[PDB]
Scaffold this motif. Structure first.
Motif, PDB file in Angstrom:
ATOM      1  N   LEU D  13     -14.382  22.676  -1.821  1.00 47.36           N
ATOM      2  CA  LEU D  13     -14.659  23.311  -0.543  1.00 47.36           C
ATOM      3  C   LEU D  13     -13.376  23.553   0.235  1.00 47.36           C
ATOM      4  O   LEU D  13     -13.215  24.601   0.871  1.00 47.36           O
ATOM      5  CB  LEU D  13     -15.616  22.440   0.263  1.00 47.36           C
ATOM      6  N   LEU D  14     -12.456  22.589   0.210  1.00 44.36           N
ATOM      7  CA  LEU D  14     -11.199  22.770   0.929  1.00 44.36           C
ATOM      8  C   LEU D  14     -10.425  23.960   0.383  1.00 44.36           C
ATOM      9  O   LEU D  14      -9.863  24.754   1.151  1.00 44.36           O
ATOM     10  CB  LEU D  14     -10.362  21.498   0.841  1.00 44.36           C
ATOM     11  N   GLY D  15     -10.376  24.099  -0.940  1.00 45.43           N
ATOM     12  CA  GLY D  15      -9.722  25.261  -1.515  1.00 45.43           C
ATOM     13  C   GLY D  15     -10.358  26.559  -1.060  1.00 45.43           C
ATOM     14  O   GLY D  15      -9.662  27.515  -0.695  1.00 45.43           O
ATOM     15  N   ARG D  16     -11.691  26.609  -1.064  1.00 43.68           N
ATOM     16  CA  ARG D  16     -12.366  27.819  -0.608  1.00 43.68           C
ATOM     17  C   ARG D  16     -11.999  28.136   0.837  1.00 43.68           C
ATOM     18  O   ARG D  16     -11.725  29.296   1.189  1.00 43.68           O
ATOM     19  CB  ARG D  16     -13.877  27.654  -0.749  1.00 43.68           C
ATOM     20  N   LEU D  17     -11.986  27.111   1.685  1.00 44.24           N
ATOM     21  CA  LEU D  17     -11.670  27.314   3.093  1.00 44.24           C
ATOM     22  C   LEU D  17     -10.262  27.864   3.260  1.00 44.24           C
ATOM     23  O   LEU D  17     -10.033  28.787   4.053  1.00 44.24           O
ATOM     24  CB  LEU D  17     -11.828  25.996   3.843  1.00 44.24           C
ATOM     25  N   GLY D 106     -10.613  25.605  -7.008  1.00 44.64           N
ATOM     26  CA  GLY D 106     -11.500  26.150  -5.997  1.00 44.64           C
ATOM     27  C   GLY D 106     -10.867  27.305  -5.252  1.00 44.64           C
ATOM     28  O   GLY D 106     -11.518  28.320  -4.987  1.00 44.64           O
ATOM     29  N   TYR D 107      -9.588  27.169  -4.907  1.00 43.62           N
ATOM     30  CA  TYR D 107      -8.895  28.242  -4.206  1.00 43.62           C
ATOM     31  C   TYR D 107      -8.957  29.538  -4.996  1.00 43.62           C
ATOM     32  O   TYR D 107      -9.304  30.594  -4.457  1.00 43.62           O
ATOM     33  CB  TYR D 107      -7.443  27.840  -3.954  1.00 43.62           C
ATOM     34  N   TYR D 108      -8.622  29.479  -6.283  1.00 44.44           N
ATOM     35  CA  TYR D 108      -8.583  30.706  -7.072  1.00 44.44           C
ATOM     36  C   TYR D 108      -9.978  31.281  -7.272  1.00 44.44           C
ATOM     37  O   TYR D 108     -10.176  32.498  -7.163  1.00 44.44           O
ATOM     38  CB  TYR D 108      -7.905  30.448  -8.409  1.00 44.44           C
ATOM     39  N   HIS D 109     -10.959  30.425  -7.560  1.00 43.54           N
ATOM     40  CA  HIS D 109     -12.326  30.912  -7.691  1.00 43.54           C
ATOM     41  C   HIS D 109     -12.754  31.647  -6.433  1.00 43.54           C
ATOM     42  O   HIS D 109     -13.309  32.749  -6.500  1.00 43.54           O
ATOM     43  CB  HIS D 109     -13.272  29.749  -7.978  1.00 43.54           C
ATOM     44  N   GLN D 110     -12.492  31.058  -5.268  1.00 47.35           N
ATOM     45  CA  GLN D 110     -12.874  31.708  -4.023  1.00 47.35           C
ATOM     46  C   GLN D 110     -12.141  33.027  -3.846  1.00 47.35           C
ATOM     47  O   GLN D 110     -12.743  34.032  -3.456  1.00 47.35           O
ATOM     48  CB  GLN D 110     -12.597  30.783  -2.842  1.00 47.35           C
ATOM     49  N   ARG D 111     -10.841  33.047  -4.130  1.00 52.28           N
ATOM     50  CA  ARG D 111     -10.067  34.250  -3.854  1.00 52.28           C
ATOM     51  C   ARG D 111     -10.505  35.407  -4.736  1.00 52.28           C
ATOM     52  O   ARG D 111     -10.539  36.555  -4.284  1.00 52.28           O
ATOM     53  CB  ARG D 111      -8.577  33.986  -4.034  1.00 52.28           C
ATOM     54  N   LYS D 112     -10.839  35.136  -5.997  1.00 54.95           N
ATOM     55  CA  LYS D 112     -11.252  36.229  -6.868  1.00 54.95           C
ATOM     56  C   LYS D 112     -12.476  36.938  -6.310  1.00 54.95           C
ATOM     57  O   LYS D 112     -12.584  38.166  -6.393  1.00 54.95           O
ATOM     58  CB  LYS D 112     -11.540  35.717  -8.274  1.00 54.95           C
ATOM     59  N   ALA D 113     -13.410  36.181  -5.737  1.00 53.91           N
ATOM     60  CA  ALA D 113     -14.645  36.781  -5.250  1.00 53.91           C
ATOM     61  C   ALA D 113     -14.372  37.809  -4.161  1.00 53.91           C
ATOM     62  O   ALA D 113     -14.973  38.888  -4.151  1.00 53.91           O
ATOM     63  CB  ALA D 113     -15.581  35.693  -4.730  1.00 53.91           C
ATOM     64  N   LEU D 114     -13.463  37.497  -3.237  1.00 51.05           N
ATOM     65  CA  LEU D 114     -13.263  38.350  -2.073  1.00 51.05           C
ATOM     66  C   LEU D 114     -12.869  39.772  -2.444  1.00 51.05           C
ATOM     67  O   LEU D 114     -13.174  40.697  -1.687  1.00 51.05           O
ATOM     68  CB  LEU D 114     -12.197  37.749  -1.162  1.00 51.05           C
ATOM     69  N   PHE D 115     -12.203  39.971  -3.576  1.00 50.29           N
ATOM     70  CA  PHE D 115     -11.761  41.294  -3.987  1.00 50.29           C
ATOM     71  C   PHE D 115     -12.757  41.985  -4.905  1.00 50.29           C
ATOM     72  O   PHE D 115     -12.480  43.089  -5.383  1.00 50.29           O
ATOM     73  CB  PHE D 115     -10.402  41.203  -4.672  1.00 50.29           C
ATOM     74  N   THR D 116     -13.904  41.367  -5.159  1.00 47.37           N
ATOM     75  CA  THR D 116     -14.909  41.985  -6.004  1.00 47.37           C
ATOM     76  C   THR D 116     -15.572  43.151  -5.275  1.00 47.37           C
ATOM     77  O   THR D 116     -15.415  43.339  -4.066  1.00 47.37           O
ATOM     78  CB  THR D 116     -15.963  40.962  -6.416  1.00 47.37           C
ATOM     79  N   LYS D 117     -16.317  43.947  -6.034  1.00 47.98           N
ATOM     80  CA  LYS D 117     -17.068  45.062  -5.471  1.00 47.98           C
ATOM     81  C   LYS D 117     -16.133  46.091  -4.849  1.00 47.98           C
ATOM     82  O   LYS D 117     -16.088  47.243  -5.279  1.00 47.98           O
ATOM     83  CB  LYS D 117     -18.063  44.556  -4.427  1.00 47.98           C
TER      84      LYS D 117
END
Lengths: 199, 286, 117, 117, 286
Positions: D13-17, D106-117
């Motif tokens: 969660l901290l990485g995502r944040l 977690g950081y990388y997983h979260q960051r990849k999502a933001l650039f999807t679509k």
């Protein structure tokens, strides 16, 4: 060549009869030949004290010829008379790789008493999956030393070889059969001669 | 250069007020701290740099007091100076093949550089010149109790680069320690001084530098900070007479009786010193 | 046989990641005397959980230099890292011998691709 | 494998944040010379309790500036931030090595999502 | 020279503050740890190095107290020196073919060198000289609680080599352990001591070295370290009277009463010793 010590007194009668019979008739060779040669290969440890300053080879011309003949006749495989860069058999590829590793080491540290051939020839052929990672790890130290040389000597060339050979493998096998070890020996023998043979 | 003939140890106290004693590159510029307890920390390298600067200022480049690690020097060129001085021909990475030449090079280098003669240096590099340990060593400095830094916002009228949101203004921030008190330890060894030739005049100059370290270091980021105490233990023979940790235990600092709130001045603390074992002499330079 | 971008064997992915990190460092600081391969190759293959958290810091430190120039070569590495890590779940604390062999195989497969046209 | 919105592992969660915070800043101040991750990445992963509060404080300014003009997602970003910080119990003072690795994952997983679509 | 006449076992405790006790050269310079549990480690080779250094420093090359492994030496030359001392011409790989000459050459070496007499050595190189085991040896040290190393970043003003922008500067880093406590084990065997003459005075000197080991090796990276406890068990017989592991269990170390935060001083722990079996004595020399 197969005697315990290279003396006629120790030649097994069974081989004496069988080889001659097969030669005359063209039938299959005795089945005990391959393990007989492999034992001699895996047991011998020559040392620099011999009169010839360069240390003795254990994979000699005669033994390789014998292994090739046995594989051709009994097992119905195919073997080239010299190095073939398009083989793609895992035992053959591993045999090739071992030679380049030894070549790199002996260049990095001249005059060493104990080369990898003196400590890993048997187990590597028997259980590749148990030792190869250490050899690869040491190859890094060996190569890096050359890179920092003012001339850089080799360094790029050996790495190019290692990349191109490895590209055809997927995993290291846990165990191998006798004929697989024979293929390993043949691959090692061919590659060794490929070096030393530009000039 | 004659060598000291006794083993020394010392402890130093200094204080800061509304300042940032030492910033942390990896935390923006917050002061370094012990994350598990909140006590502050200061690297010894900072103190060594301060001493180097003071010596350079005071001696003004006199003979046998040059500084090796200067503002913007290139170290390989400095090494080559020793080689040319002794009339030798540098080798790409190896020392001179005869022991006499190598010893001459190292002696020449130790002769005229005070900081090498004091702290030692690593000079294998490319123009090889050997290694040195140096008889003087220091440890990290730790605060006596937790600290709580604060950040402050500020404003600047002008702008730095051309922008089209313009005119515009900018805002930044700082960090500050309201108050804190620190402690440091050090050692001196005779066997190494004998090797490098660390002399007694050097020791007196070292005391002087410690006393007046901060007077020349005023800056915008650092508030007022100054030294408060200095205790020295001298052993009677070439080797120690007692364990080190037992000596450091003699000095004790505790909250002054009249202080109840958060500390905000040196008057809030009390300092005392015990009695040294018979084999050591204790004298107080501050 | 060649680089298989769909294998999804954790040692294989780690091997690929190491190669890409080395490539990034080489791009950032030309002619370095010492490289991460010399400093860490032995440790990472044995105990991945101990060193990767350190390698990833220097990764960003290096990419910062490139992205701050007119050198645009520099989100390619970030994209690759996003792809590779996308399949990982956790870092093993320790690995067996054969797993290390697979790690080396993946590393070498990855390295060759980077130097193609 | 990809971003798992129900892992509930605190470093994850901290990485995502951290990823969402850096994205917010990037949107707020284009072309910045020094970004938050260049300034704080090491400390954030090592000692979360030291810095995270002030990072959260500054975030309000970035969102406030964005939502002052006819551009939006900013409500989306603050929604992510709130829903994530809902699950976190407390910021640890220190973390182990494997925990730091999980942070990066977690950081990388979260960051990849933001650039999807 | 009379050999000892009893079997021994001992335990040692020591700790470190803000330093790197022993970094192993394969993970950058991380302090050596156990990956699966986080407990720290130290190699016995490190400790034996310090003992060698202390003896060399304190005795100053006195007779019968030379050290075989000196800094940057060549061992084959020492072997040849032994051969000349016993007046034999060395063969390329073999000992003299007469037993008396081999015994003489081995005994000269075992006599004039202390560390060989104490720890043994492998000397079967080109100048063949035999082997030795040595009556003393130690195991790995292990911390009592998991350690949490910290990374530190630093800066320097100057630069080392010429290049396009080499105006410039640079950065580095360090690792440190805020605190840690370690334990060690060791053994001594009379039967082997009988083969080398390891005498009681050597034993007293060994105790003295153990207590005063860290007093001389201060350096920038090592911080502050010291010894805290030394316990020795003595048997009444040339052979043992109880299993080794039973004795080691008699000593327990645990959290001090009322201590809750992470340990930061030796006062945070409590140590106790049980009662030994009938056939063994126990002493607390430190």
């Amino acid at each position: 060549q197969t005697a315990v010590l290279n003396k006629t007194e120790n030649i097994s009668p069974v081989l004496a009869g069988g080889l001659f019979r097969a030669m005359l008739t063209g039938g299959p060779y005795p089945q005990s030949l391959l393990p007989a040669v492999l034992g001699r290969i895996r047991a011998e440890h020559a040392r620099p004290e011999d009169k010839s300053r360069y240390r003795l080879e254990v994979v000699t011309y005669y033994r390789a010829a014998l292994i090739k003949a046995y594989l051709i006749r009994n097992r119905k495989l195919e073997v080239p008379v010299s190095l073939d860069p398009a083989r793609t058999d895992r035992p053959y590829l591993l045999g090739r790789l071992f030679a380049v590793l030894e070549k790199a080491q002996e260049d990095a540290v001249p005059g060493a008493n104990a080369t990898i051939k003196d400590r890993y020839l048997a187990s590597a052929s028997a259980n590749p999956g148990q030792v190869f990672h250490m050899l690869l790890k040491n190859a890094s130290n060996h190569t890096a030393k050359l890179r920092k040389d003012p001339e850089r000597k080799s360094a790029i060339h050996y790495e190019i070889m290692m990349q191109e050979i490895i590209d055809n493998i997927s995993d290291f096998p846990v165990t191998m059969s006798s004929d697989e070890q024979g293929l390993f020996m043949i691959g090692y023998y061919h590659q060794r001669k490929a070096l030393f043979t530009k000039k | 250069m004659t060598a000291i003939a006794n083993r020394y140890e010392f402890v130093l106290l200094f204080d800061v007020e509304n300042g940032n004693p030492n910033g942390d590159p990896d935390a923006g510029n917050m002061p370094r701290i012990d994350p598990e307890t909140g006590h502050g920390l200061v690297t010894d390298v900072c103190l060594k740099r301060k001493i180097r600067n003071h010596v350079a200022l005071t001696k003004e480049g006199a003979e046998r007091f040059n500084i090796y690690i200067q503002e913007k020097a290139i170290l390989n060129e400095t090494h080559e100076r020793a080689y040319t001085a002794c009339d030798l021909k540098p080798e790409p990475k190896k020392l001179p093949k005869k022991v006499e030449d190598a010893k001459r090079v190292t002696d020449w280098m130790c002769t005229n550089f005070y900081d090498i003669r004091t702290f030692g240096a690593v000079m294998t590099t490319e123009v090889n010149c050997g290694q040195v340990r140096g008889p003087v060593q220091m440890a990290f400095a730790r605060s006596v109790e937790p600290v709580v830094p604060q950040e402050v916002s500020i404003t600047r009228m002008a702008v730095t680069t051309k922008a089209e949101a313009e005119d515009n203004r900018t805002m930044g921030r700082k960090h500050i320690v309201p108050y804190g008190l620190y402690v440091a330890h050090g050692f001196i060894s005779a066997p190494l001084a004998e090797k490098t030739g660390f002399s007694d005049e050097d020791l007196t100059l070292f005391w002087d530098a410690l006393v007046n370290m901060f007077e020349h270091d005023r800056s915008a980021a650092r508030g007022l900070m100054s030294s408060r105490k200095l205790i020295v233990f001298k052993h009677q023979n070439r080797l120690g007479n007692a364990p080190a940790h037992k000596l450091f235990d003699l000095v004790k600092v505790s909250r002054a009786e009249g202080s109840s709130g958060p500390a905000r001045s040196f008057a809030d603390y009390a300092v005392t010193v015990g009695q040294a074992p018979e084999g050591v002499e204790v004298k107080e330079m501050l | 046989v060649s680089l298989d971008p769909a294998r999804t064997d954790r040692p294989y992915l780690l091997g690929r990641l190491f190669a890409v990190l080395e490539k990034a460092q080489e791009d950032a600081v030309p002619g370095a005397n010492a490289t991460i391969k010399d400093r860490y190759l032995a440790s990472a293959s044995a105990n991945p959980g101990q060193v990767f958290h350190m390698l990833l810091k220097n990764a960003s430190n290096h990419t910062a230099k490139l992205r701050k120039d007119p050198e645009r070569k520099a989100i390619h590495y970030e994209i690759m890292m996003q792809e590779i890590i996308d399949n990982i779940s956790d870092f093993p604390v320790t690995m067996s011998s054969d797993e290390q062999g697979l790690f080396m195989i993946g590393y070498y497969h990855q390295r060759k691709a980077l130097f193609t046209k």
